[PDB]
């Protein structure tokens, strides 16, 4: 009933992350016997997509209450470390915007808003 | 593994809702620490014939 996923759009949970075994007499390939989170990170590499987020904070401008800086999260909160508009302008200040309250920097006045995308 | 959260949940010992007072555990634990040098002295002075 279940079958091996071929691309990121075919992944439906962890039972589609089990590959086809190598046949007798040959050296196994990565695509033949990887599983789990290690296999999901490989399917993204083949298409050119990074499945783990590693980019730093957006310091292009200073958010305001009218036009804040949107921050995405898979929970109700995220920790944010602000150092000023051109990164490194002032000493770092850690904040925690939540789904009910924005965060403002007491040092520079930058405003950060949350954007929840997680699904229980 | 999933654990609980709260105030008295991240320690290995029980402080509330217990039958015996917590003072017997708290000061009994630190009494045994303070008392091991004296047990050593007793054994060795009982070997030299001082006792």
């Amino acid at each position: 009933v279940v079958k091996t996923a071929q691309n990121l759009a075919e992944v439906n949970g962890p039972e589609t992350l089990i590959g086809p075994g190598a046949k007798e007499g040959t050296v196994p390939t990565d695509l033949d016997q990887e599983t789990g989170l290690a296999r999901l990170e490989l399917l993204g590499k083949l298409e050119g997509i990074d499945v783990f987020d590693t980019k730093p904070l957006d310091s292009s401008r200073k958010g305001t209450m009218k036009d804040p800086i949107i921050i995405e999260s898979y929970d109700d909160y995220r920790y944010v470390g602000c150092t000023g508009s051109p990164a490194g302008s002032h000493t770092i200040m850690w904040l925690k915007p939540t789904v009910n309250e924005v965060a403002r920097c007491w040092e520079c006045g930058s405003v950060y808003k949350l954007n929840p995308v997680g699904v229980p | 593994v999933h654990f609980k959260d709260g105030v008295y949940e991240n320690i290995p010992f029980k402080v509330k809702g217990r039958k015996t007072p917590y003072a017997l555990s708290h000061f009994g634990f630190f009494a045994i620490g303070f008392a091991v040098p004296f047990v050593a002295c007793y054994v060795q002075l009982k070997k030299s014939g001082a006792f």
């Binding site: 949970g13 962890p14 050296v27 196994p28 990565d30 783990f52 997680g118 699904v119 | -």
Partner: protein, 269 residues
């Protein structure tokens, strides 16, 4: 994969190990070993049967710990790119510490030899001591070791290239070459004219080359573990970390033995 599906998978690549009994079972075997050896070295225990049992339990309890790392990487998929990079870096810091253990044994050798003590005869080696000659059975050993660092190189590159038979043969040969080195030191020991009891010379000599002997027995156990895993299809052409740690091991032990052979055999004799 939308937002709904991405929620079912981790947001970071690092490995969350489940609780295990092994770390606290290894600690108890370590205390049973310490208490038994001190008690038998001083006569409170009649024989060596309790020391034997404590060594057997320290051994089979590390096996089970290693058995649970195989399953977490071959059957569960928990070794992502970041987990793999951390494992390699932890192993390099392990060998750096083991290298400095030999560095302390080379200090003790040079301290005893550059200004030798007068009860020896103020001469190195001391009078009456017949030492091991370099151009001998120790010269067969330095060739047998250099010959295994090139048969292990072509096995590793035959696995990346997808050749199975060539990979499986260049490892079965590295195994029996380290085995040959081990029994060659055994012959060299039961025939030597001096003993570890023969003063400070027999102490620094058998300590430096005797520790290296023990690592080689550990090195031959690692190549046998890789042999089972490569023959039973655990290792893939791009994911074989239990193999690279073994390869780095055979090259450091090669350099250490090279130093032993130049100082303990050519300069100190």
């Amino acid at each position: 994969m939308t937002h709904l599906e991405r929620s079912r998978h981790q947001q970071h690549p690092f490995h969350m190990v489940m609780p295990s009994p092994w770390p606290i079972v290894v600690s108890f075997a370590l205390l049973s070993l310490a208490l038994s050896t001190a008690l038998t070295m001083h006569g409170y225990i009649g024989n060596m049967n309790m020391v034997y049992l404590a060594l057997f339990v320290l051994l089979t309890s590390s096996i089970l710990w290693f058995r649970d790392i195989v399953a977490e990487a071959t059957y569960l998929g928990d070794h992502t790119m970041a987990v793999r990079k951390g494992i390699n870096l932890g192993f390099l810091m392990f060998v750096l510490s083991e290298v400095l253990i030999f560095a302390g044994l080379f200090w003790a050798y040079f301290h005893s030899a550059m200004s030798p003590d007068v009860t020896l005869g103020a001469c190195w080696p001391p009078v009456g001591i017949e030492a091991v000659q370099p151009t001998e059975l120790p010269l067969l050993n330095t060739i047998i070791l250099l010959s295994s660092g090139a048969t292990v190189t072509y096995s590793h590159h035959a696995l990346i290239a997808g050749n199975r038979n060539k990979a499986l043969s260049g490892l079965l040969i590295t195994f029996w070459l380290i085995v040959i080195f081990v029994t060659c030191q055994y012959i060299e020991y039961t025939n030597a004219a001096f003993t570890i009891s023969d003063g400070v010379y027999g102490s620094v000599f058998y300590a430096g080359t005797g520790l290296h002997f023990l690592h080689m027995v550990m090195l031959a156990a690692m190549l046998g573990v890789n042999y089972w895993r490569m023959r039973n299809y655990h290792l893939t052409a791009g994911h074989h970390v239990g193999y690279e740690t073994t390869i780095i091991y055979t090259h450091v032990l090669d350099v250490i033995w090279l130093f032993l052979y130049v100082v303990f055999y050519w300069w100190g004799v």
